[PDB]
Swiss-Prot record, chain C:
<dbReference type="GO" id="GO:0002181">
    <property type="term" value="P:cytoplasmic translation"/>
</dbReference>
<comment type="subunit">
    <text>Component of the small ribosomal subunit (SSU). Mature yeast ribosomes consist of a small (40S) and a large (60S) subunit. The 40S small subunit contains 1 molecule of ribosomal RNA (18S rRNA) and 33 different proteins (encoded by 57 genes). The large 60S subunit contains 3 rRNA molecules (25S, 5.8S and 5S rRNA) and 46 different proteins (encoded by 81 genes).</text>
</comment>
<keyword id="KW-0687">Ribonucleoprotein</keyword>
<dbReference type="InterPro" id="IPR047863">
    <property type="entry name" value="Ribosomal_uS8_CS"/>
</dbReference>
<dbReference type="GO" id="GO:0022627">
    <property type="term" value="C:cytosolic small ribosomal subunit"/>
</dbReference>
From Swiss-Prot, chain D:
<dbReference type="GO" id="GO:0003735">
    <property type="term" value="F:structural constituent of ribosome"/>
</dbReference>
<keyword id="KW-0689">Ribosomal protein</keyword>
<protein>
    <recommendedName>
        <fullName>Small ribosomal subunit protein uS12A</fullName>
    </recommendedName>
</protein>
<dbReference type="GO" id="GO:0000462">
    <property type="term" value="P:maturation of SSU-rRNA from tricistronic rRNA transcript (SSU-rRNA, 5.8S rRNA, LSU-rRNA)"/>
</dbReference>
<dbReference type="GO" id="GO:1990145">
    <property type="term" value="P:maintenance of translational fidelity"/>
</dbReference>
UniProtKB/Swiss-Prot annotation, chain F:
<dbReference type="InterPro" id="IPR001931">
    <property type="entry name" value="Ribosomal_eS21"/>
</dbReference>
<dbReference type="GO" id="GO:0005829">
    <property type="term" value="C:cytosol"/>
</dbReference>
<dbReference type="GO" id="GO:0006412">
    <property type="term" value="P:translation"/>
</dbReference>
<comment type="function">
    <text>Component of the ribosome, a large ribonucleoprotein complex responsible for the synthesis of proteins in the cell. The small ribosomal subunit (SSU) binds messenger RNAs (mRNAs) and translates the encoded message by selecting cognate aminoacyl-transfer RNA (tRNA) molecules. The large subunit (LSU) contains the ribosomal catalytic site termed the peptidyl transferase center (PTC), which catalyzes the formation of peptide bonds, thereby polymerizing the amino acids delivered by tRNAs into a polypeptide chain.</text>
</comment>
<protein>
    <recommendedName>
        <fullName>Small ribosomal subunit protein eS21A</fullName>
    </recommendedName>
</protein>
UniProtKB/Swiss-Prot annotation, chain I:
<dbReference type="GO" id="GO:0005829">
    <property type="term" value="C:cytosol"/>
</dbReference>
<keyword id="KW-0689">Ribosomal protein</keyword>
<feature type="modified residue" description="Phosphoserine">
    <location>
        <position position="15"/>
    </location>
</feature>
<comment type="similarity">
    <text>Belongs to the eukaryotic ribosomal protein eS30 family.</text>
</comment>
<dbReference type="InterPro" id="IPR006846">
    <property type="entry name" value="Ribosomal_eS30"/>
</dbReference>
Length: 97, 25, 129, 96, 117, 87, 206, 217, 62
RNA sequence: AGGGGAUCGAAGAUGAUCAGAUACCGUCGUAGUCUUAACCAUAAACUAUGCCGACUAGGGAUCGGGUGGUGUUUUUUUAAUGACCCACUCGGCACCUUACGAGAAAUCAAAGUCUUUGGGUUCUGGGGGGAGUAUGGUCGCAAGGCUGAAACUUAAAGGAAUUG
């Protein structure tokens, strides 16, 4: 029996889409699919901004952030527990955690 | 065996019977 | 495309008599429907219906009164010998006691008990109970 | 809908598609292709009288274990070789 | 750790219900009550029960704890639940109406003082 | 259900619903018996004399058991201006 | 039927606009559209409070007829009407059910709350669904107060109100309480109001 | 000695209800099996099947028997009971009750001429209990119950003199066969024939008539 | 699979069962007489029962 | 066949891993991967769900069109236009809930209106193997496509869900 009403993920009224590549696996998953997390962070991280904002000139200055957008595969999403196997009822939830 | 290497097998088995056949034209 | 007219009609009546509804619209109003509604009205399986003039094909509103189990149509309008009428009412009617398989003879669209009595036959139209 | 056509003028399409499908029906094909008159070791006939060749002690299938006692027979009317089973206890000793 | 069992807590919900006047906040006296209105087959259970009934009392007489009801509390809560002010219905300056609610009355048969909001 | 000598057989005659005329089955345990009392010389509801409407499990699961009441109340005059035949 | 005293009298109608029961939910529902007179701009709805009262009297009329007024279960789980169905229970026979309904009531006899009413009245069908479901297994008519987005399922006569708080639920409970008393009972001469304060059917906390 | 705990049950031990169809008229959920015990004794019982089933526990296995019983007379009243439990004896007992707590009213009738005592059914009816769908057809006199020996004996207590049957589905699962041969005859009271077209005024429900003698203490 | 087994022992069990002669006895009636004889037996006099009536039990339970 | 030939990379090599390791991992790389002009006609080419039609139930989003709106926000003065809001109506990609109904069930707004069995119409399937085999035919430069048996064989094969 069908174990997902979305089959894979969100195509519907198409039948094909471009493929993305995993950043870990280097797999080929259809872009419609793919677990997809946005990775923003900080150049200096939390612990170093003290010795950073000390030793740096400029009046305080505007901390930059590294912007990256991670696409995963179900394979590598599940193992690295980005996503995790839930119950038959629980799986249905599309709401962010 | 998997039915895709079973499919493979029946093609080698046919390419090989085209051979033994026309061994006498 | 539309292929029977009587069909969508008698289906709307059938469907709506299930959902509890007491009225129903019909498209489009064709003579054949009407006589079929005339058969049904007299034996008390609907109420009064009302034609509607849209200079086009027509609409009907029919009042429902419970006591309608099914109003079927039989397609294609088979040729029915006058003896073979028994073998239809046997098939698609619930008991010998009541029920009606309205035909369509050259004497006119009518129920089978009527044709039973006039001694005429023809092409089965549908059926009501 | 109901897949099939319901037209009053379509008996042709109906009578032939049923013919064009009786062929998936096993024991109908065997009758129309006369397998019985062809590849069957008898003729189609209920019985055939052959000559007894060698005798066979055929082992039984799983999960049983015994010696089934049979005969290889040369049916007179075809010359077809056919192995046949002898029933009851010791009857193998009645045939030679 | 120490989690008292139902056979205990069952017995505390019962003595408190059946004997709220005669229970008290002290552990010692209840222990003696228990050897009167109850037949407890072992001293410990006798003590353990009375301990729990007495625990409830130190939070009964400080709030109407969840699943227990006896007389003098039920009669206590029936009174308190009859407060009636000089009312708020009233109106201290006519009926404040938005609109169409006004038209609701105009088309109904009714007087009533109004306002437009 | 009559018979030979005009005699009445068949255990009972089942109730018919007042919003669909469709029989109330023996085990139609979602069906309802609505008893509405009358009013004599100003107020003073009469015990013993009711306006009893019957409803079936179907109509009440569908949700028309209200619209059907208000309609069937104005029918024998018990309401005014509520049910509007025309929509 | 019901003469002319049972019409409006805007002292009753004063209670309604005062309890705010006229204000109707935004999310309507198809089985509740007649009760909607109009919808105020800035996203609001306005109940046709006449019908509310009209059904109300119809409501009371059903509460009578049934003999033993005790086993006419008035129920609520919402706190806002709990104190109200207690005061109603007090006046009329009316066995009350406040708090949790505890499944197994109307069906399943062994239980410690096996009521066998012949009529049921409910505050909010959403939150009281379990009463309404369970009723439907035992042929028990159901009265209930209904805003606009409330499940008409498995209910019969519905009184249209607000059940969003404030005074809506008590009033309609207080009013029900009044006319169940005018009819038969011990009120008579309905021309005068009631010796009983309204603000008694309400909430607590305090 | 019986002691009733439901309103329905009090009225019947009283004598305030004399017949069964009084309950069927008012759709009264019979809960105490004593009611039909008394509203119709002489009611005959037949056990039809006692088949075993199984289960695995948090260790090994689990096994128990399953009783299927029909109860009825032959004057329109029948019920079906299935209950599986630890023993064969307790199974039979527990189910008979279950069958009786659900006895049904049968609308018999005529196939053609109404010439004295109904013999067959009102109309065609047809039940379904997954896959297996049983459908009963009226039958001329002297015909008989044409059905499976199982359904025969079930219509035998139902009280049918002649009927034809058309079993579809996996009739071998005996359970779901009967249930739909049940679902069939019980349906008979739901087919709006024109005889019943004529309206009655709706009775009053003995729960409000004897409403005094109805409630508890 | 394998097809020349050991014919050496066909007729084994029959040729080694102790022969027994049939104990003679007066013939049973034939025709109606038997079927009559059957009729009065199975349900006229009634012999051994268990609530269920048992046709061919030997030494019974006792 | 011509171009192209970064890249990644069937073959192949080479490093490790292993008991073996033709493999997974790592390195080098042929073909291919791009295009032109030819062919090829196959994918789980999937929604594993034919098409036109009629009907049976609610709910909020969202795309395209239109309509209504002394709604909003925009200038230098609050008008045109622009976006935005509300309601709405057709035609969309769906979702949500229900369940009258349907199903072996998982489940479906169709997979509903089917033993109360007929709106029109195309196609396929009739136990598992043998086997998409043999053979004839035909298309293809080829690989292959399309059509497509039988003898013999066997009592399960198989779905859904339940507990372990
Ligand atoms: Mg996909
Ligand atoms: Mg695709
Ligand atoms: Mg494959
Ligand atoms: Mg291959
Ligand atoms: Mg075969
Ligand atoms: Mg040999
Ligand atoms: Mg089937
Ligand atoms: Mg390699
Ligand atoms: Mg290799
Ligand atoms: Mg070429
Ligand atoms: Mg190709
Ligand atoms: Mg293909
Ligand atoms: Mg395919
Ligand atoms: Mg919809
Ligand atoms: Mg779209
Ligand atoms: Mg190749
Ligand atoms: Mg075997
Ligand atoms: Mg498969
Ligand atoms: Mg499986
Ligand atoms: Mg499992
Ligand atoms: Zn990956």
């Amino acid at each position: 029996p069908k174990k997902r009403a979305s089959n894979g993920r969100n195509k519907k009224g198409r039948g094909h889409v471009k493929p993305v590549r995993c950043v870990n696996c280097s797999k080929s998953i259809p872009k419609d699919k793919a677990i997809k997390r946005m990775a923003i962070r900080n150049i200096v991280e939390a612990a170093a901004v003290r010795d950073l904002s000390e030793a740096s000139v400029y009046p305080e200055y505007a901390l930059p952030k590294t912007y990256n957008k991670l696409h995963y595969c179900v394979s590598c999403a599940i193992h690295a527990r980005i996503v995790r196997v839930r119950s038959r009822e629980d799986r249905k939830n599309r709401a962010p955690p | 065996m998997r039915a895709k290497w079973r499919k493979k097998r029946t093609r080698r088995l046919k390419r090989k019977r085209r051979k033994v056949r026309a061994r006498s034209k | 495309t539309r292929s029977s007219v009587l069909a969508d009609a008698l289906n709307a009546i059938n469907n709506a008599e299930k959902t509890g509804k007491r009225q129903v619209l019909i498209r489009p109003s064709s003579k054949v429907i009407i006589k079929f509604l005339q058969v049904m009205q007299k034996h008390g399986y609907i109420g009064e219906f009302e034609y509607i003039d849209d200079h086009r094909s027509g609409k009907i509103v029919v009042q429902l009164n419970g006591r309608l189990n099914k109003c079927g149509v039989i397609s294609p309008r088979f040729n029915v010998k006058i003896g073979d009428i028994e073998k239809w009412t046997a098939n698609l009617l619930p008991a010998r006691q009541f029920g009606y398989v309205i035909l369509t003879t050259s004497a006119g669209i009518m129920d089978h008990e009527e044709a039973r009595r006039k001694h005429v036959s023809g092409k089965i139209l549908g059926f009501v109970y | 809908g109901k897949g099939k056509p319901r037209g009053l003028n379509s008996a042709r399409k109906l009578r032939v598609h049923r013919r064009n499908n009786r062929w998936a029906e096993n024991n109908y094909k065997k009758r129309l292709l006369g397998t019985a008159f062809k590849s069957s070791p008898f003729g189609g006939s209920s019985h055939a009288k052959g000559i007894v060749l060698e005798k066979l002690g055929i082992e039984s299938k799983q999960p049983n274990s015994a010696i089934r006692k049979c005969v290889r027979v040369q049916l007179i009317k075809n010359g077809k070789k056919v192995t046949a089973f002898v029933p009851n206890d010791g009857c193998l000793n009645f045939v030679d | 750790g120490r989690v008292r069992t139902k056979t205990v807590k069952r017995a505390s919900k019962a003595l408190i219900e059946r004997y709220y006047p005669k229970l008290t906040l002290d552990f010692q006296t209840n222990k003696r009550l228990c050897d009167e209105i109850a037949t407890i087959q072992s001293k410990r259970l006798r003590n353990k029960i009375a301990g729990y009934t007495t625990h409830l009392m130190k939070r009964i007489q400080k709030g109407p704890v969840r699943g227990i009801s006896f007389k003098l509390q039920e009669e206590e809560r029936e009174r308190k639940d009859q407060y009636v002010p000089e009312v708020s219905a009233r109106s201290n300056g006519v009926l404040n109406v938005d609109n169409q609610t006004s038209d609701l009355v105009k088309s109904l048969g009714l007087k009533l003082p109004l306002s437009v909001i | 259900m009559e018979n030979d000598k005009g005699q009445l057989v068949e255990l009972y005659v089942p109730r018919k619903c007042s919003a669909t005329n469709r029989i109330i089955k023996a085990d139609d345990h979602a069906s309802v018996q609505i008893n509405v009392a009358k009013v004599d010389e100003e107020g003073r509801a009469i015990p013993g004399e009711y306006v009893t409407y019957a409803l079936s499990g179907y109509v009440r699961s569908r949700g028309e058991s209200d619209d059907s009441l208000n309609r069937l109340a104005q029918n024998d005059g018990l309401l005014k201006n509520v049910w509007s035949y025309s929509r | 039927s019901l003469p002319a005293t049972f019409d409006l009298t805007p002292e009753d109608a004063q209670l309604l606009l005062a309890a705010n029961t006229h204000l109707g939910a935004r999310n309507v529902q198809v089985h509740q559209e007649p009760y909607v007179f109009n919808a105020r701009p800035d996203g609001v709805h306005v109940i046709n409070v006449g019908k509310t009262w009209e059904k109300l009297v119809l409501a009371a009329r059903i509460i009578a007829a049934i003999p033993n007024p005790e086993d006419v279960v008035a129920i609520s789980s919402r706190t806002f009407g709990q104190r109200a169905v207690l005061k109603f229970a007090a006046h009329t026979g009316a066995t009350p059910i406040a708090g949790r309904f505890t499944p197994g009531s109307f069906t399943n006899y062994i239980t410690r709350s096996f009521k066998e009413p012949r009529l049921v009245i409910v505050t909010d069908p959403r939150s009281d669904a379990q009463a309404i479901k369970e009723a439907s297994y035992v042929n028990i008519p159901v009265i209930a107060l209904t805003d606009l987005d409330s499940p008409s399922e498995f209910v019969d006569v519905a009184i249209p109100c607000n059940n969003r708080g404030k005074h809506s639920i008590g009033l309609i409970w207080y009013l029900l309480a009044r006319e169940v008393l005018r009819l038969r009972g011990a009120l008579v001469d309905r021309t005068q109001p009631w010796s009983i304060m309204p603000d008694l059917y309400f909430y607590r906390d305090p | 000695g019986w002691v009733p705990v439901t309103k329905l049950g009090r009225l019947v031990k009283a004598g305030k209800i004399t017949t069964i169809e009084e309950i069927f008229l008012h759709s009264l959920p019979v809960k105490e099996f004593q009611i039909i015990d008394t509203l119709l004794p002489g009611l005959q019982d037949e056990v039809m099947n006692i088949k075993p089933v199984q289960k695995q526990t948090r260790a090994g296995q689990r096994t128990r028997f399953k009783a299927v019983v029909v109860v009825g007379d032959s004057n329109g009243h029948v019920g079906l009971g299935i209950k599986t439990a630890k023993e064969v004896a307790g199974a039979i007992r527990a189910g008979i009750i279950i069958a009786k707590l659900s006895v049904i009213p049968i609308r018999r009738g005529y196939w053609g001429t109404n010439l004295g005592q109904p013999h067959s059914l009102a109309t065609k009816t047809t039940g379904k209990c997954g896959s297996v769908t049983v459908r009963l057809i009226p039958a001329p006199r002297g015909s008989g119950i044409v059905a499976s020996p199982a359904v025969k004996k079930l219509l035998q207590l139902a009280g049918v003199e002649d009927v034809y049957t058309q079993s579809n589905g996996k009739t071998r699962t005996l359970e779901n066969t009967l249930k739909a041969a049940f679902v069939a005859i019980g349906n008979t009271y739901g087919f709006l024939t024109p005889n019943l077209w004529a309206e009655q005024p709706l009775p009053v429900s003995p729960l409000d008539i004897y409403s005094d003698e109805a409630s508890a203490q | 699979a394998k097809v020349h087994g050991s014919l050496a022992r066909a007729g084994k069990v029959k040729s080694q069962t102790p022969k027994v002669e049939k104990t003679e006895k007066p013939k049973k009636p034939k025709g109606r007489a038997y079927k009559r004889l059957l009729y009065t037996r199975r349900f006229v006099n009634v012999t051994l029962v268990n609530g269920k009536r048992r046709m061919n039990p030997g030494p019974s339970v006792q």
